[PDB]
Amino acid sequence: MGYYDIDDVLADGTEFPCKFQYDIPGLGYLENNPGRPITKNTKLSLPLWLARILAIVGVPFVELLPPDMFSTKVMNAIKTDPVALDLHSINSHFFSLAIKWIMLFSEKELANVVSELLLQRAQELNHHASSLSIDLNTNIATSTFLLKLEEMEKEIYKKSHESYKDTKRWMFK
């Protein structure tokens, strides 16, 4: 959560569904009505970095609604088959946003689910990372699994696979 983390910066600017609590005047600069105000009980999508502050200061101005990524459907999908889930399709920065949402809401069950998902997928990505192709003179499963990773999983995978490749190169040099 460092200030200059590029992944954190990208994750901050993600729209989230959230209704309003006041008929606040003069807002909507790019929300389809620059001069016209924003009405009470209005459901709009707002960037997470701004919605975070707007959800605490106030009764808070904005009531955050549960996003589609953390709906009970996705929860059931995660609890069913963590390995065969294309989490990249759900979002490129799913784990960071899960961490931020849990930190804001102290929602322990989501944290318990996401930790299990992370462990189960870490097992498989380590299996793939330590698998090094050797030329007798890019496996199909490797690539078809790599597309279902967020940037952090793609980063841990790159680092671990680089370490494995360096070890193999030094060992057999």
């Binding site: 784990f95 961490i99 849990i102 930190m103 102290s106 929602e107 322990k108 944290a111 318990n112 996401v114 930790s115 992370l118 462990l119 870490a122 097992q123 380590n126 299996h127 990372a129 330590s130 952090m152 841990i156 680092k159 671990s160 680089e162 370490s163 494995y164 360096d166 070890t167 190169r169 030094w170 060992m171």
Partner: protein, 195 residues
Amino acid sequence: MSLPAHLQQTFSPEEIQFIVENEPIKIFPRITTRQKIRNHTRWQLITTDDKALNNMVAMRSTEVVLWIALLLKQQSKCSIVAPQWLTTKELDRKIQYEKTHPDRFSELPWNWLVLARILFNKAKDDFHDPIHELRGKIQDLREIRQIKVLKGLKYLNESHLQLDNLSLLEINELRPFITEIMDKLREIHTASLTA
């Protein structure tokens, strides 16, 4: 930056090799530097003790730092002695011990893989055992330890971990993955425990 990204928190295998290069090992000097009672320049180093080097006697085993022994082994002016764990009998006993206890690692010296690689590369003709068998048994130990590591990975908790008797190279190669997964699991728990 001053430190490249791939060297941020782990050691490159060359660094592990360099670190292991400072271990003392017993060798047979092919020269005799013992200046008789009846000029020459002493090694008079500062990273190690020159006393043994200035007092080497031909075909009389001494103990010197590993990399000096390798430097001498670049010529035929020395000879490396394999440590007691580099015998076929001890390797077989360690194999049996590993196969007997599936949940605990063998009590090998921490630098066994790198030492085996270095000795095989540069001291391939100083073993009483057939090198083609030593290589196979070393590879078998590496595979068995890998299999044990993978099964021990299925219990990655969020508080701590105990990798007992594990070697150095395996730890170095597994550091970036385990130390990063453990960080994310700790962060999730701490975010949950924000009350």
